[PDB]
Design a protein around this ligand. Structure first.
Ligand SMILES: [Cl-]
Ligand SMILES: [Cl-]
Length: 296
């Protein structure tokens, strides 16, 4: 996987993350773990690979920093469907209970911070998994607006931050994550394998509204996947397969013309579109949701 192995980078990250409890994912050799402890951090190591645990546990006995090491793969917590039957893969409810982490309301301040690096070849998969957890307020997000800082490769970073201003890279996860979080680059590291961006993902206090909730976000995801399935088409073309309501009237309410294209819609335009349909009255039904669309 990806590991912080450069001492100078580790010292830089420690100042970023300190300047509250820290969950470090896949510390590996523990160069960042040691830098965090030297800097005075309180760290819980979630290490997926057992072979690194002896040295990590050696670090906590001898350094002036309370360290707890758990054999836990953060990216396998609370499988979206499955039986929780894997030693390294666990439930966040059981982990957070053992760690004494208490849930707080969505509106409250950040209870906890998670830091690490996305897997080099599972970035989209991980972003989808976290997005489902976030919008549903399950897994770690059952406990509040968890701050997540993750290194990501440049290609997926540029796609995540794209919008109508850069249409060629604009896709479903761009909308999902820009609505969910204010995303900021905390560091950029040039590695032999390509540029890595450390992005800070703090869930927005105002993500959820009267009409976008943890109970109906899946309909919103369906709208987005449907639209970006034919990204060059008009929004009205897609709406005719999404809602029985008058698609032209809907678009007018959000200030868009009939010929508006999917790729010209900003993330907030999609949110207002979804809320506008949800708002409508005297309707036996607002959506034609009858199919499961793949995560792309
Ligand atoms: Cl229509
Ligand atoms: Cl409905």
């Amino acid at each position: 996987k990806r590991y912080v192995t450069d001492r100078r980078l580790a010292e830089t990250l420690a100042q970023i993350y300190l300047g509250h409890l820290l969950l470090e994912c896949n510390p590996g050799p523990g160069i960042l773990t040691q830098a965090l402890l030297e800097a005075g951090a309180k760290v819980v190591a979630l290490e997926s690979d057992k072979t690194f645990i002896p040295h990590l546990e050696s670090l906590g006995k001898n350094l002036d920093g309370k360290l707890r090491v758990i054999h836990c793969d953060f990216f396998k917590l609370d499988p979206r469907s499955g039986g929780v039957i894997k030693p390294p893969a666990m439930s966040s409810r059981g982990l957070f209970k053992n760690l004494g982490i208490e849930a707080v309301p969505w509106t409250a301040d950040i209870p906890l911070k998670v830091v690490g690096m996305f897997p080099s070849r599972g970035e989209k998969r991980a972003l989808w998994k976290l997005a489902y957890d976030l919008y549903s307020c399950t897994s770690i997000y059952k406990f509040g607006r968890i701050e997540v800082n993750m290194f990501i490769g440049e290609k997926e970073f540029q796609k995540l931050m794209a919008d109508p201003g850069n249409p060629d890279l604009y896709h479903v996860l761009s909308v999902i994550w820009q609505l969910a979080c204010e995303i900021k680059v905390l560091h950029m590291e040039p590695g032999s394998s390509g540029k890595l961006y450390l992005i800070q993902m703090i869930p927005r206090q105002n993500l959820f509204t009267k009409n976008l909730t943890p109970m109906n976000y899946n309909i919103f995801f369906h709208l987005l996947k449907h639209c970006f399935g034919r990204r060059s088409a008009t929004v009205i073309d897609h709406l005719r397969s999404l809602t029985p309501l008058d698609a032209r009237d809907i678009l007018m309410q959000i200030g868009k013309q009939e010929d508006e294209k999917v790729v010209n819609m900003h993330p907030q335009d999609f949110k207002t579109l979804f809320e506008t349909i949800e708002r409508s009255k005297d309707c036996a039904y607002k959506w034609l949701y009858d199919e499961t669309l793949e995560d792309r």
